[PDB]
């Protein structure tokens, strides 16, 4: 029923910028929360980022604080993930989830996407 | 983003004769209890300098506004000269009166 | 609380216009020959948060 | 009473003296698209004095993350809107009060 | 704490006859007050009757005399509507609430219930 479909990543030298964007579609919307999500290979999902729909309940990573930018386009149903100065650790393979954080209940990832993979070196990919 | 708007007939200007110290005490209690803020007052004419005589005055209401709101710190307003048109020191600043 | 503008040239410039707290209640006098005193403001943190 | 409106937005004093009359809206105030145009609070600090009003809409900490701004984790607006589906059981549906 | 259950409800053809029972559970009584109350779609709720615990100063809707009859029974903490002659405008939908009717100070409807639907037609539901 629903789809999320990323795009924007790649590789770049440490201390670069980059632009994850993913968009979603089969979503009654009424309090969609999108967050952007890291798996470092051996290792679990870490919360990269989230944000609702205009409830702007946003969150960051502690050791992130600057480093990424979240933002919306409720009219293309999108979110967008710039990021600058990426350090070597941000190498990472980067999902989006679609949810509903309803602030009397909790929040659930309700659907996971494809993703994309971030490559912080001196070489590229 | 305001809710009460609400006028009425004045009761500051009350003032007796023209060359007194100080002429005309006037006092105002405020009471906010219950979402209701209660204003008492009551004016003495009475002439001296370092006021609050030792006399005895039974304040009556003027008003009970329906407000609803907190309220814990509170100011003073006063209408102040502007002193760039007057007499006295005008350069560019303001200059106040004796109350 | 003081409102004298007037002094000998030395120091000039006195008035009092704090912010003060309301606490249970507040009264209040004045003694002017004049109408410096106009009014009042209350609230909790006035600036545009309440 | 307790509960989210008699703490939270609403309050009678325990001497209250007066009526409460409350009557069923859903003809003038749910719409098949769902009417979000009504809101209420859902988290406050304390309990509301009497015939208290609160608009204010700043930021809620929830849990122990200081979020001085929007950015945050259990930080969250202190509204909510009322889904008002028509389709809402009357328990849910809205009502229009006058006291 | 509490809960009001409805049963009795569905579709009968016009001049029939149905019966509605709404229980209810969670009441330390006293001056428990159960109503019930018609949504027709396209407009608000509409009084239809009500009944207190043994007080019987019954309420009915000025168009709805004689069709419907109330009943209570205690015991099993319950309340019935015996619905005849159905014309056809009582296709709608009833809920059963409960309160307290007080002589001195008045009533309120604490709380509702799950609700049934009723169709007056020609073919069934």
């Known amino acids: 029923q629903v789809q999320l479909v990323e795009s924007g990543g790649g590789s770049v030298q440490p201390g670069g910028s980059l632009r994850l964007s993913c968009v979603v579609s089969?979503?009654?919307?009424?309090?969609?929360?999108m967050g952007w999500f890291r798996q470092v290979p051996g290792k679990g999902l870490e919360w990269v980022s989230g944000?609702?729909?205009?409830?702007?309940?946003?969150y960051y990573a502690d050791s992130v604080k600057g480093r990424f930018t979240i933002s919306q386009d409720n009219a293309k149903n999108t979110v967008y993930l710039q990021m600058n100065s990426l350090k070597p650790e941000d190498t990472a393979m980067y999902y989006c989830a679609a949810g509903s954080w309803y602030n009397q209940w909790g929040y659930s990832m309700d659907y996971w996407g494809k993703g994309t993979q971030v490559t912080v070196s001196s070489s590229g990919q | 983003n305001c809710t009460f708007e609400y006028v009425s007939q004045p009761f500051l200007m009350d003032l007796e004769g023209k060359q007194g110290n100080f002429k005309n005490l006037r006092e105002f209690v405020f009471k906010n209890i219950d979402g209701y803020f209660k204003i008492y007052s009551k004016h003495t004419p009475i002439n001296l300098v370092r006021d609050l005589p030792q006399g005895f005055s039974a304040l009556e209401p003027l008003v009970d506004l329906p407000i609803g709101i907190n309220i814990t710190r509170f100011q003073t307003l006063l209408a102040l000269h502007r002193s760039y048109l007057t007499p006295g020191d005008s350069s560019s600043g303001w200059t106040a009166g004796a109350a | 609380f003081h409102a004298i503008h007037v002094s000998g040239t030395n120091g000039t410039k006195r008035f009092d216009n704090p912010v003060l707290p309301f606490n249970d209640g507040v009264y209040f006098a004045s003694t002017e020959k004049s109408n410096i005193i106009r009014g009042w403001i209350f609230g909790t943190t006035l600036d545009s948060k309440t | 009473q307790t509960g989210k409106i008699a703490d939270y937005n609403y309050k009678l004093p325990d001497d209250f003296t007066g009526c409460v009359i409350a009557w069923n809206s859903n003809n003038l105030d749910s719409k098949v698209g769902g009417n979000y145009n009504y809101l209420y609070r859902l988290f406050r600090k304390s309990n509301l004095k009497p015939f208290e009003r609160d608009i204010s809409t700043e930021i809620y900490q929830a849990g122990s993350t200081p979020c001085n701004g929007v950015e945050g984790f259990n930080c969250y607006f202190p509204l909510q809107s009322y889904g008002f589906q028509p389709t809402n059981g009357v328990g849910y549906q809205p009502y229009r009060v006058v006291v | 704490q509490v809960q009001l259950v409805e049963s009795g409800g569905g579709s009968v053809q016009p001049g029939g006859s149905l019966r509605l029972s709404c229980?209810?559970?969670?009441?330390?009584?006293?001056?428990?007050?159960?109503?019930?109350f018609r949504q027709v779609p396209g407009k608000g709720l509409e009084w239809?009757?009500?009944?207190?615990?043994?007080?019987?100063?019954?309420?009915?809707?000025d168009s709805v005399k004689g069709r419907f009859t109330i009943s209570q029974d205690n015991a099993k903490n319950t309340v019935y509507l015996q619905m005849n002659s159905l014309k056809p405008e009582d296709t709608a939908m009833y809920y059963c609430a409960a309160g307290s009717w007080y002589n001195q100070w008045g009533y309120s409807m604490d709380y509702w219930g799950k609700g049934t639907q009723v169709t007056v037609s020609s073919s069934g539901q």
């Open positions: 944000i609702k729909r205009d409830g702007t309940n946003t």
């Open positions: 089969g979503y009654t919307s009424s309090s969609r929360y």
